[PDB]
Design a protein around this ligand. Structure first.
Ligand SMILES: [Mg+2]
Ligand SMILES: [Mg+2]
Ligand SMILES: [Mg+2]
Ligand SMILES: [Mg+2]
Ligand SMILES: [Mg+2]
Ligand SMILES: [Mg+2]
Ligand SMILES: [Mg+2]
Ligand SMILES: [Mg+2]
Ligand SMILES: [Mg+2]
Ligand SMILES: [Mg+2]
Ligand SMILES: [Mg+2]
Ligand SMILES: [Mg+2]
Ligand SMILES: [Mg+2]
Ligand SMILES: [Mg+2]
Ligand SMILES: [Mg+2]
Ligand SMILES: [Mg+2]
Ligand SMILES: [Mg+2]
Ligand SMILES: [Mg+2]
Ligand SMILES: [Mg+2]
Ligand SMILES: [Mg+2]
Ligand SMILES: [Mg+2]
Ligand SMILES: [Mg+2]
Ligand SMILES: [Mg+2]
Ligand SMILES: [Mg+2]
Ligand SMILES: [Mg+2]
Ligand SMILES: [Mg+2]
Ligand SMILES: [Mg+2]
Ligand SMILES: [Mg+2]
Ligand SMILES: [Mg+2]
Ligand SMILES: [Mg+2]
Ligand SMILES: [Mg+2]
Ligand SMILES: [Mg+2]
Ligand SMILES: [Mg+2]
Ligand SMILES: [Mg+2]
Ligand SMILES: [Mg+2]
Ligand SMILES: [Mg+2]
Ligand SMILES: [Mg+2]
Ligand SMILES: [Mg+2]
Ligand SMILES: [Mg+2]
Ligand SMILES: [Mg+2]
Ligand SMILES: [Mg+2]
Ligand SMILES: [Mg+2]
Ligand SMILES: [Mg+2]
Ligand SMILES: [Mg+2]
Ligand SMILES: [Mg+2]
Ligand SMILES: [Mg+2]
Ligand SMILES: [Mg+2]
Ligand SMILES: [Mg+2]
Ligand SMILES: [Mg+2]
Ligand SMILES: [Mg+2]
Ligand SMILES: [Mg+2]
Ligand SMILES: [Mg+2]
Ligand SMILES: [Mg+2]
Ligand SMILES: [Mg+2]
Ligand SMILES: [Mg+2]
Ligand SMILES: [Mg+2]
Ligand SMILES: [Mg+2]
Ligand SMILES: [Mg+2]
Ligand SMILES: [Mg+2]
Ligand SMILES: [Mg+2]
Ligand SMILES: [Mg+2]
Ligand SMILES: [Mg+2]
Ligand SMILES: [Mg+2]
Ligand SMILES: [Mg+2]
Ligand SMILES: [Mg+2]
Ligand SMILES: [Mg+2]
Ligand SMILES: [Mg+2]
Ligand SMILES: [Mg+2]
Ligand SMILES: [Zn+2]
Lengths: 138, 85, 208, 124, 104
RNA sequence: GCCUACGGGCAGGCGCCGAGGGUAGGGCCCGUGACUGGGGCGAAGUCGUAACAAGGUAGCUGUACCGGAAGGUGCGGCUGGAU
RNA sequence: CCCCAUGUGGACCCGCCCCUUGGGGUGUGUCCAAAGGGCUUUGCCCGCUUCCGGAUGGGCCCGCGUCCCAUCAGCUAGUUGGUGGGGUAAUGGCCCACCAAGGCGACGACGGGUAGCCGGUCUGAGAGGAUGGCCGGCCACAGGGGCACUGAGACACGGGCCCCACUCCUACGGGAGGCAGCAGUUAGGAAUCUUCCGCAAUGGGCGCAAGCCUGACGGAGCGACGCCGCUUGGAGGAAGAAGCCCUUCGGGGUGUAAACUCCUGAACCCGGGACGAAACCCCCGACGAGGGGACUGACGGUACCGGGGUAAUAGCGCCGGCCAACUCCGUGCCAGCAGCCGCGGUAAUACGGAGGGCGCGAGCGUUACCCGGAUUCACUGGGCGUAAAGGGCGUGUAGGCGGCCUGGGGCGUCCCAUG
């Protein structure tokens, strides 16, 4: 059965992008939509929009790519080169502030769930708090 | 009985002592209650004796009889001296 | 002990001029001037390409040999240099250069680094008014490095300071020729030392 | 494994078995010789190799290679043995140290002398 | 602070005493999962007042018997048999698991 | 029996607990060891030629029976079986 | 040592008030103290008694952490709890009597194996592994096993009682002894030190002090066992002696190396010569503060200083690849090498010698062991169609894990302050 719906979200985006889908729908959730809200700001996705599939709450994620390339394979650079779930059910991953990590020498994101919100590594380290280490992106 | 005495901490031919509060019975260089200043018998430095008076005064005030060389060193930094009239 | 034995020869194994000798290392006699190949039966024969180890090794040796120094004293400094806040490649040379044996030579009291170690060890050197004779003593900035009042009259002491008539001393140092004193001003920045070493290769050799 | 599997069953560290049991933890043992014989080597090699069978202070009866171009070992030679297998002679996981007890150094040896108990000759 | 734990009664069968089952969660020291280990405490019930299924608070105490070093502190929540069942079935299954034998 | 201020104390005597030992009867772990199983080896020979090519009866496999052994056959199963 | 008295005060029963596990107060009854010595003798010093608090040192108890085997799966009857009693400084099956039938275990009970634990240390990028002499902290033992006595404190290493094993004395009834204190003897072993100096220092015991004691400790000795520092020279010196080695016989190599020239001056000689040690004490002052005075050094005639002053130990591994370093000769699957792959059967850069070279240098190698390399137990950080690896298939227990919205709790989790 479904056990991690945030994995499922991330992985939906991952697989989507690799086929250069313009967009994919993901069953909605206050939480997921927060993570998306983050991904939006940081420019990994053009944005998400809340839609309705058969009267079921969903979230249309609109993916973003590189420019076309010359050479014999022209499939654009990815913008979300690597997305990956860190704290998972059946091994949760809590990080204290002085243990929140750096993703790709500052070039990537770690998305954190804290008692002060869903924060990026930088956002969280600025508010001086830590929490559950959800995923990493770059 | 609690004592104020010397705990050697130098090398060989390099004696460096440490003024300390400790139960009579502990090893000359053992777990001590509280350190109250160092003392360097050879005076290799302009500062070969410090004491922290006010602490030592406290410990004497609850009767930590100090050894003879220690009383001397204490006295020298004037743990005992009063004032005026 | 330290290395005693034939030197213009390491001059040759390293294939560059180490100035381990002195008055003739400068003349048309360094055998680099006469036989620039390495010592032995086979130095005439064309070389094999060096392994990475080879190049890492030799660059280490070249640097070490230049300075006198045992590998145990050498490695121990490179060790100390890594424990330093700094760019160890540079920090190292600064540390090397801080040796009394060396400071003396750079000062121009001794013809060479080898001759310098004796000048130190036989007591001919003042550091801050006192005697020092460990070639390994570390000179810090602000230190004054003089000739003993006693040893003031040596032929080489006087003969060498008369070459100072026309040399000028390193930029991190100051010489008082007449007074026979020198002062150590600061550590030499990398750009001051102009050795034929690629310090980085040395570092690499040690991270194996 | 899953995580819960490692929490449940852990990881099994790896135990190292000693290729030199006869020396019960020490670096050499002394023994006396029983058989001192020659033995024919293994796979692609030919020769007649010198081997001693040695009764140890550790109780074990083991066989030991006698290194060196020529020796002087015998039915009651007191000798000392160290680690060091010989690939060609199987069931030989110890060497005999030369120049100790009743094992002479090699005579005439002028090169890797410390490995053969030969002292440095004068006038060389 | 005398220690205070919270747990459930799994045993009446003792004179002036209850067995309290206390759970504790904590991350695994290497694998960092949260693991649910547990312990049984013998608690002085001077009045029989606490029945089985009661969740209770229990407090560090001047020694009573050999094993009794805790007093029952107060009632947290009474009637909670699900937990007690989990204790008993965990127990019952033990009589399997053997090697002397089994049945059909 | 001793001391006493006549209240009692001391020696001594008995009893439980008890280290240890005795008899019987179990269980366990090391030392030696009569007689033995194969096994891996390790020098190139005996008698076969099962497998590798369709290996000259496709091969393998569990289980049987025969055979000292290699193997043979029976009953199924597998293709990791060649045209 | 003991009885009587005063009892500030305390102890005990009983009752009340606050407090709350046996805490503080209070009231009647009871019960409990004591020691003298010295002198600079009409008052000072040391000591005595009961009690309240401090100080320091310990007992006991609880949470959490604490190696391997499941080819050890069930363990337990003082066992688990109760009530009462004994004992203790005090809780407690710690002990005893009676009552109840409990206690523990797959979150590994019980059994077997191994081990003193830690601050740390070694390694490692980390995580982790490994280790716990030497220093410091806790524990445990003092020839094996019991046991209590003195006491603030022990069930006591150089105290006591008994049994056993060992050794010695013995008149054969009996008795003696305990280095895992320092040094040493001996055995065992690959292997581990002087039957040294000193109580000068610091520390400890006893004393008013002078002092006594102190194998704690402060030092010397022996061992490259380890780390660090130092030396065996420095400068000049040939198109380059000899000898040894290679050679295509032209020459090349050791090699500025040597010789030889100047310079310096470890060793050593003479002279001076420590710091560590100033208190205890005595005197003035008050017995305080403060001031004055004297005694005291094992190391050690050492370190260190001054003057003089001699060119004055070098060895070990290695040179096929990993891996820095190549030639000749001997040998001929022999002798031998060998960490691994391999080398040697007549041209061996791998055996052996030589020259030459490389690497370190009072050290260099070898063996043994830990960590590394070994993402080769994979938390970081691995796998399972054919490489080792999916249970023959299902059912389902414990357990693990689990959709969308809102709200409470705040256990996990996160932040701050403090210990
Ligand atoms: Mg944390
Ligand atoms: Mg000395
Ligand atoms: Mg104590
Ligand atoms: Mg490394
Ligand atoms: Mg290994
Ligand atoms: Mg018995
Ligand atoms: Mg066939
Ligand atoms: Mg066939
Ligand atoms: Mg046939
Ligand atoms: Mg047949
Ligand atoms: Mg068939
Ligand atoms: Mg009261
Ligand atoms: Mg009375
Ligand atoms: Mg009297
Ligand atoms: Mg009973
Ligand atoms: Mg009771
Ligand atoms: Mg042990
Ligand atoms: Mg690693
Ligand atoms: Mg570590
Ligand atoms: Mg340990
Ligand atoms: Mg110790
Ligand atoms: Mg210790
Ligand atoms: Mg003994
Ligand atoms: Mg005993
Ligand atoms: Mg005693
Ligand atoms: Mg004891
Ligand atoms: Mg003794
Ligand atoms: Mg001894
Ligand atoms: Mg012996
Ligand atoms: Mg004293
Ligand atoms: Mg000592
Ligand atoms: Mg030494
Ligand atoms: Mg040695
Ligand atoms: Mg050295
Ligand atoms: Mg020639
Ligand atoms: Mg010269
Ligand atoms: Mg002279
Ligand atoms: Mg003195
Ligand atoms: Mg003085
Ligand atoms: Mg005075
Ligand atoms: Mg004295
Ligand atoms: Mg007076
Ligand atoms: Mg003298
Ligand atoms: Mg002199
Ligand atoms: Mg002179
Ligand atoms: Mg000489
Ligand atoms: Mg190497
Ligand atoms: Mg090479
Ligand atoms: Mg060899
Ligand atoms: Mg070799
Ligand atoms: Mg050779
Ligand atoms: Mg040679
Ligand atoms: Mg050589
Ligand atoms: Mg590993
Ligand atoms: Mg994993
Ligand atoms: Mg693998
Ligand atoms: Mg197969
Ligand atoms: Mg397979
Ligand atoms: Mg299957
Ligand atoms: Mg299978
Ligand atoms: Mg379930
Ligand atoms: Mg759940
Ligand atoms: Mg949920
Ligand atoms: Mg919710
Ligand atoms: Mg809420
Ligand atoms: Mg809260
Ligand atoms: Mg909370
Ligand atoms: Mg937390
Ligand atoms: Zn030169």
């Amino acid at each position: 059965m479904l056990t991690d719906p945030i994995a499922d979200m991330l992985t939906r985006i991952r697989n989507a992008t690799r086929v250069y889908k313009e967009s994919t729908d993901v069953p909605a959730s206050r939480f997921k939509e927060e993570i998306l809200r983050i991904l939006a700001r940081e420019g990994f996705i053009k944005g998400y929009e809340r839609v309705d599939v058969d009267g079921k709450p969903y979230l249309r994620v609109y993916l973003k790519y590189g420019p076309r390339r010359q050479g014999p394979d022209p499939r654009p650079e990815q913008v979300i080169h690597h997305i990956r779930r860190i704290s998972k059910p059946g091994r949760r991953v809590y990080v204290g502030v002085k243990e929140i990590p750096r993703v790709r020498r500052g070039l990537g994101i770690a998305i954190l769930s804290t008692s002060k919100g869903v924060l990026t590594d930088r956002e969280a380290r600025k508010l001086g708090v830590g929490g559950e280490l959800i995923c990493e992106v770059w | 009985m609690v004592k104020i005495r010397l705990a050697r901490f130098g090398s060989k031919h390099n004696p460096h002592y440490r003024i300390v509060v400790t139960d009579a019975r502990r090893k000359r260089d053992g777990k001590y209650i509280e350190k109250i200043g160092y003392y360097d018998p050879r005076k290799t430095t302009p500062d070969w004796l410090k004491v922290d008076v006010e602490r030592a005064r406290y410990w004497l005030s609850v009767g930590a009889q100090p050894t003879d060389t220690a009383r001397r060193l204490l006295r020298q930094a004037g743990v005992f001296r009063q004032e005026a009239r | 002990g330290r290395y005693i034995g034939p030197v213009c020869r390491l001059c040759r194994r390293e294939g560059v001029k180490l100035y381990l000798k002195g008055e003739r290392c400068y003349s048309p006699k360094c055998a680099m001037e006469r036989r620039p190949y390495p010592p032995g039966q086979h130095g005439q024969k064309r070389a094999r390409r060096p392994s990475d180890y080879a190049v890492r090794l030799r660059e280490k040796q070249k640097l070490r040999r230049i300075y006198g120094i045992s590998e145990r004293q050498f490695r121990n400094l490179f060790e100390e240099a890594s424990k330093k806040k700094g760019v160890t490649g540079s920090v190292f040379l600064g540390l090397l250069e801080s040796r009394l044996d060396n400071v003396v030579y750079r000062l121009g009291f001794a013809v060479s680094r080898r001759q310098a170690r004796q000048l130190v060890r036989h007591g001919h050197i003042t550091v801050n008014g006192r005697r020092v004779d460990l070639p390994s003593y570390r000179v810090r900035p602000g230190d004054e490095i003089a000739v003993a009042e006693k040893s003031r009259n040596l032929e080489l002491i006087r003969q060498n300071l008369e070459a100072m008539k026309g040399r000028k001393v390193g930029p991190w140092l100051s010489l008082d020729v007449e007074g026979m004193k020198g002062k150590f001003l600061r550590l030499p920045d990398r750009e001051d030392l102009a050795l034929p070493v690629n310090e980085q290769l040395v570092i690499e050799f040690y991270s194996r | 494994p899953t995580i819960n599997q490692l929490v449940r069953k852990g990881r099994e560290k790896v135990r190292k078995k000693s290729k030199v049991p006869a020396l019960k933890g020490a670096p050499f043992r002394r023994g006396v010789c029983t058989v001192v014989r020659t033995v024919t080597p293994k796979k692609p090699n030919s020769a007649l190799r010198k081997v001693a069978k040695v009764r140890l202070t550790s109780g074990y009866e083991v066989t030991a290679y006698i290194p060196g171009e020529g020796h002087n070992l015998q039915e009651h030679s007191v000798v000392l043995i160290r680690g060091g297998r010989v690939k060609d002679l199987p069931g030989v996981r110890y060497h005999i140290v030369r120049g100790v007890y009743d094992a002479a150094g090699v005579k005439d040896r002028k090169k890797s002398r410390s490995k053969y108990g030969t002292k440095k000759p004068k006038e060389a | 602070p005398k220690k205070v734990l919270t747990g459930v009664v799994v045993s009446d069968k003792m004179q002036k005493t209850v067995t309290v089952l206390v759970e504790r969660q904590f991350p695994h020291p290497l694998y960092g999962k949260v693991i649910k280990r547990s312990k049984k405490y013998l608690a002085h019930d001077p009045e029989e007042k606490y029945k089985l299924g009661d969740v209770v608070e229990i407090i560090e105490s001047r020694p009573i018997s050999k094993r009794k070093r805790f007093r029952v502190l107060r009632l947290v929540e009474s009637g909670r048999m699900d937990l007690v069942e989990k204790y008993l079935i965990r127990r019952q299954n033990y009589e399997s698991l053997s090697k002397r034998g089994g049945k059909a």
